[PDB]
């Protein structure tokens, strides 16, 4: 069987629209377990720096009780069937998802009926979640990777709603009140911004009947009739450097502005990342990895680990690399990393393009294994693209990438650009911004 | 090839003159990356024997002396200890080069 | 018969420890010297647990299973 | 449309099980009974080095060729190990996975184990042990299994600090020639047919005896280990002997595990239907986490209580959990609690077999343990046959046994085994 018709044998996601504008999408497979979730366009980018932690505080409180099921009884409704109830919030998308069995498919929709509609916010829960979130961020600032990524968003998107963290500053956490959470729920938990996704052993018609009978009362109507626009954000080439020499080793991330979701050359950028890839100190290949950055990083013992990311948002994003290493090699890692980017702008040959295409194909198919990743892709794709892209379309878009358009796209996005730098730890040998800006181009080109 | 080529090989082995410093053939090989890797892959006994023979040769060439004729390394008793390791290193380098070609 | 170290005949210097702040005229026999040993590898700062919500799920319930890979990070799952 | 998994037992003892998914991607694993169970004191840490040294040169493929050819087609090579068995896995596209098996079989069948490469990755052993011991649950379970057994299961997953630099390639050759035999292997395929798997088994796999070396029966020891290391939280595992895999009481012990609480079903929840969490929550007012530990092996099992607590509150947390189990063992439980525990257990099994990794791991585990693959519906059916009286018998089995204790942290107020 050829890969194309094997990819065509995957069942298609079925999408339908209620009269509220809420989208309902399902994908059917042969599993005995299903994953049902609600995806809302309500992140930290929709906040106005006085409700900067409203989404995090709400997603803390969302499993603490409704106006019909008071508190822990809701927990029993999840725990007496073995379902796993989960939630997360990015800067743009907020998901409440749950994994259960198929026989419990109606009743569990009931939970997603009243999690996003009839949340009850008791005040004792408000101060309890207030100091829980305070010690949660006091725990989370120890993780240097989250600190570096939040610093990168702070220095890359200065003065924009996309710089602020999902959790927000500590002063708002001690300042969010009941009415502000009510206003956030009224403005952002509306009907046309919500996608009910299901993956696994579900049928689309039964899911539609349950979705109608439960979520037909979601608002669709505005409070003050003022549409919250999702404005463009100004990327700013800059640096931020937090020097703390007591830390054992440093985390450094360098990014440039990338296109987002709607631009198809994102797929080309993914192949570029698949040329450079990732490396960790606990790998197995050694010096014989195909990535030249990883091979030189294990040959000279430069870094503890590095990875490449392509983070996207509405018409914007970040595209770059993040490495943790000891201090004495930091600039050398930068030099080698920058050199790899310049090769992808100048000397891209078909062998590494074929290798990166194969890596992206295998990673893309193997990522969509499991009802929870399939439901995540359905909800995120209908929030971002407005439709679910079948994997055959992804295969057709991948197959059109050769070396010429790869180095064209990489010269567009990487060559002679102003990056955003975020360093944390013993970063004295991290070079000054003029050295990185000089490393963004070659004099031999 | 039968009659005198082996005899000419014996005469050339006597004439080249590393046998009268106690050296074997593979001690005389100039280091490259391949030869250094093949030396690095040697076991401890052959490595220590090689390094002692090399510094004995340097001691003898300091004083402009040679070994006594009974201590000259014999042509038949000369073992080619290094060249399987060197051939394996050359083979894997050629594999890496032909992969880098395509 | 006091002097608990001298209660044990051969186990006098094992039960006791005798540092010398100012070393006198006579040197002790077996001066002793540490070998230049190795160093442990460096690791990043870990995740502390300061609340009940973060600690949930951290208690082990299944046997320890380790996994290595050629280009995937090494992991351990409980 | 996922038609039927086909099963085959060759006369040399080799197992081949494959399923025709017609998937875009294929996953092929080889399951060998070659864990840390099969080392005596002479060759400790050999299995760890072999797990790390799977990607070395082979008699038929070099390590440059193996690494570059696996990364050239985008496939994945992984080794997953426990105390009992090891598993080798390749993941790829259907059009390439055939030659991927070639690489896998070299790694299993003809390793050269050159001395310089083994000397190279002993440092990788040290780094991997440090990374895996960065979590405290690892060293708690390692010390717990060391204390709980005398021989053949007290051997660690991770190599001891003295054996690093002391493992040679001859010991790895001995381990391969004595435990990678024919009748200790199951070859599992997903996204393939039977004919290609039978062909590659006929090519590479059909040369060794099959019985190999047995082991040392895992005699129970008991006792306690207390490691004072100065952290903010104190970890303590108290276990006792329990039934093995394939016994009629392993299902009752798993039901008792999920009845006492084995994981949070709600993110940032309060663990309402967990009995141990209920008792310690009504007791204490500090951060904690208590759960039930189950670990069943081929001929033995351990069941017990895992507690993470504060330094000055460890005694009341441990005593509250232990008195909760003592109250369970007297028969103070409801039938709806056992029904919810069975729901939790069968839900965990069904969501464990959903991905291809978990599915192929379960097929390989079933083939190595019983030699006869059973459908998930049969597993749920024998889960449904557990009565609450067998759960009370399992709890009384835990209470009236010789406990093994492993603790780490500030042990100022952590109790002992006789004090419980």
From TrEMBL, chain B:
Keyword Membrane: yes
Main localisation: mitochondrion
Membrane protein topology class: Peripheral membrane protein
Pfam family, one: UCR_14kD
Compartment(s) where it occurs, according to its Swiss-Prot or TrEMBL record: Mitochondrion inner membrane
GO annotation terms (biological process): mitochondrial electron transport, ubiquinol to cytochrome c
One GO MF term attached to the UniProt entry: protein-containing complex binding
Protein purpose: Component of the ubiquinol-cytochrome c oxidoreductase, a multisubunit transmembrane complex that is part of the mitochondrial electron transport chain which drives oxidative phosphorylation.
UniProt family annotation: Belongs to the UQCRB/QCR7 family.
The protein's assembly and partners: Component of the ubiquinol-cytochrome c oxidoreductase (cytochrome b-c1 complex, complex III, CIII), a multisubunit enzyme composed of 11 subunits. The complex is composed of 3 respiratory subunits cytochrome b, cytochrome c1 and Rieske protein UQCRFS1, 2 core protein subunits UQCRC1/QCR1 and UQCRC2/QCR2, and 6 low-molecular weight protein subunits UQCRH/QCR6, UQCRB/QCR7, UQCRQ/QCR8, UQCR10/QCR9, UQCR11/QCR10 and subunit 9, the cleavage product of Rieske protein UQCRFS1.
Protein name, entry field: Cytochrome b-c1 complex subunit 7
Natural source organism: Mus musculus
């Amino acid at each position: 069987a050829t890969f194309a018709q094997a990819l065509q044998s995957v069942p298609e996601t079925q999408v339908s629209i209620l009269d509220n504008g809420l989208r309902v999408a399902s994908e059917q497979s042969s599993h005995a377990t299903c994953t049902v979730g609600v995806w809302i366009d309500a992140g930290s980018r929709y906040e106005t720096e006085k409700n900067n932690g409203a989404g995090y505080f709400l997603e803390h409180l969302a499993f603490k009780g409704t106006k019909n099921r008071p508190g822990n009884a809701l927990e029993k409704e999840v725990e007496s069937i073995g379902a796993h109830l989960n939630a997360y919030s990015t800067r743009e998308h907020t998901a409440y998802l749950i994994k259960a069995l198929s026989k419990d498919l109606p009743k569990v929709v009931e939970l997603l009926a009243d999690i996003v509609q009839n949340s009850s916010l008791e005040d004792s829960q408000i101060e309890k979640e207030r100091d829980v979130i305070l010690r949660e961020m006091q725990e989370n600032d120890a993780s240097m990777q989250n600190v570096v990524f939040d610093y990168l968003h702070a220095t890359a998107f200065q003065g924009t709603p996309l710089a602020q963290a999902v959790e927000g500053p500590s002063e708002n956490v001690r300042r969010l009140s009941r009415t502000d959470l009510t206003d956030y729920l009224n403005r952002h938990y509306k009907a046309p911004r919500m996608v009910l996704a299901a993956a696994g052993g579900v049928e689309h018609q039964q899911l539609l009947d349950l979705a109608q009978k439960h979520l037909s009362s979601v608002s669709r109507v505005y409070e003050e009739d003022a549409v919250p626009g999702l404005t463009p954000c100004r990327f700013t080439g800059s640096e931020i450097r937090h020097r703390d020499d007591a830390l054992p080793l440093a985390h450094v991330a360098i990014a440039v502005e990338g296109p987002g979701w709607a631009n198809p050359d994102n797929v080309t950028l993914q192949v570029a990342n698949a040329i450079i890839g990732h490396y960790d100190c606990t790998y197995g290949g050694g010096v014989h990895l195909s990535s030249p950055l990883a091979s030189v990083a294990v040959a000279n013992k430069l870094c503890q680990s590095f990875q490449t990311f392509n983070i996207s948002y509405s018409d914007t994003g970040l595209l770059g690399a993040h490495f943790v290493c000891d201090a004495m090699s930091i600039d050398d890692m930068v030099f080698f990393l920058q050199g790899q980017w310049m090769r992808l702008c100048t000397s891209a040959t078909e062998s590494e393009v074929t290798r990166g295409k194969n890596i992206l194909r295998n990673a893309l198919v193997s990522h969509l294994d499991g009802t929870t990743p399939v439901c995540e892709d359905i909800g995120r794709s209908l929030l971002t693209y407005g439709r679910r892209i079948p994997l055959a379309e992804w295969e057709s878009r991948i197959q059109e990438v050769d070396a010429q358009m790869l180095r064209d796209i990489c010269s567009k996005y990487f060559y002679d650009q102003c990056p955003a730098v975020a360093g944390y730890g013993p970063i004295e040998q991290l070079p000054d911004y003029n050295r990185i800006r000089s490393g963004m181009f070659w004099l031999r080109f | 090839s039968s009659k005198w080529l082996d005899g000419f090989r014996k005469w050339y082995y006597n004439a080249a003159g590393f046998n009268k410093l106690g050296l074997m053939r593979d001690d005389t090989l100039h280091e490259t990356e391949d030869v250094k890797e093949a030396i690095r892959r040697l076991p401890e006994d052959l490595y220590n024997d090689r390094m002692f023979r090399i510094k004995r040769a340097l001691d003898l060439t300091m004083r402009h002396q040679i070994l006594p004729k009974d201590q000259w390394t014999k042509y038949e008793e000369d073992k080619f200890y290094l060249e399987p390791y060197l051939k394996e290193v050359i083979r894997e380098r050629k594999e890496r080069e032909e992969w880098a070609k395509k | 018969m006091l002097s608990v170290a001298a209660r044990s005949g051969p186990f006098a210097p094992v039960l006791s420890a005798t540092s010398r702040g100012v070393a006198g005229a006579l040197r002790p026999l077996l001066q002793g010297a540490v070998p230049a040993a190795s160093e442990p590898p460096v690791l990043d700062v870990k995740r502390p647990f300061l609340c009940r919500e973060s600690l949930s799920g951290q208690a082990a319930a299944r046997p320890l299973v380790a996994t290595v890979g050629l280009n995937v990070p090494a992991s351990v799952r409980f | 449309q996922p038609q039927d998994l086909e099963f085959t037992k060759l006369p040399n003892g080799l197992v081949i099980a494959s399923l025709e998914n017609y998937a875009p991607l294929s996953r092929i694993g080889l399951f060998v009974k070659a864990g840390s169970r099969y080392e005596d004191s002479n060759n400790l840490g050999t299995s760890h080095l072999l797990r790390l040294a799977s990607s070395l040169t082979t008699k038929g493929a070099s390590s440059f060729k193996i690494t570059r050819g696996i990364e050239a087609v985008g496939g994945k090579l992984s080794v997953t190990a426990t105390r009992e068995n090891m598993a080798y896995t390749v993941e790829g596209i259907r059009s390439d996975i055939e030659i991927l098996m070639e690489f896998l079989l070299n790694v299993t069948t003809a390793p050269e184990f050159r001395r310089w490469e083994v000397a190279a990755l002993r440092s990788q052993l040290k780094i991997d042990k440090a990374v895996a011991f960065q979590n405290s649950q690892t060293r708690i379970i390692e010390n717990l299994h060391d204390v709980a057994y005398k021989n053949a299961l007290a051997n660690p997953l991770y190599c001891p600090d003295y054996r690093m630099g002391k493992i040679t390639s001859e010991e790895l050759h001995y381990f391969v020639q004595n435990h990678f035999t024919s009748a200790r292997m199951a070859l599992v395929g997903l996204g393939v047919s039977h004919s290609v798997l039978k062909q590659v088994a006929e090519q590479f796999l059909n040369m060794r005896g099959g019985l190999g070396l047995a082991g040392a029966k895992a005699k129970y020891r008991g006792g306690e280990i207390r490691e004072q290391n100065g952290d903010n939280l104190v970890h303590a595992a108290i276990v006792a002997e329990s039934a093995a895999i394939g016994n009629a009481e392993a299902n009752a012990f798993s039901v008792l595990q999920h009845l006492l609480g084995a994981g949070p079903h709600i993110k940032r929840g309060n663990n309402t239907t967990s009995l141990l969490s209920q008792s310690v929550a009504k007791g204490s007012h500090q951060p904690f986490d208590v759960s039930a530990f189950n670990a069943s092996y081929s001929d033995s099992g351990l069941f017990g209580i895992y507690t993470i607590s504060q330094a000055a509150a460890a005694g009341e947390v441990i005593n509250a959990a232990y008195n909760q189990v003592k109250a369970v063992a007297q028969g103070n439980l409801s039938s709806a609690d056992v029904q919810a525990a069975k729901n939790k257990l069968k839900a965990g099994y069904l969501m464990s077999v959903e991905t291809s990794e978990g599915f192929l791991s379960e097929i390989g585990s079933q083939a190595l343990a019983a030699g006869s693959y059973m459908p998930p519906s049969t597993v749920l059916q024998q889960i449904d046959s557990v009565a609450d009286a067998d759960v009370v018998k399992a709890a009384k089995k835990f209470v009236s046994g010789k406990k093994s204790m492993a603790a780490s942290g500030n042990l100022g107020h952590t109790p002992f085994l006789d004090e419980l």
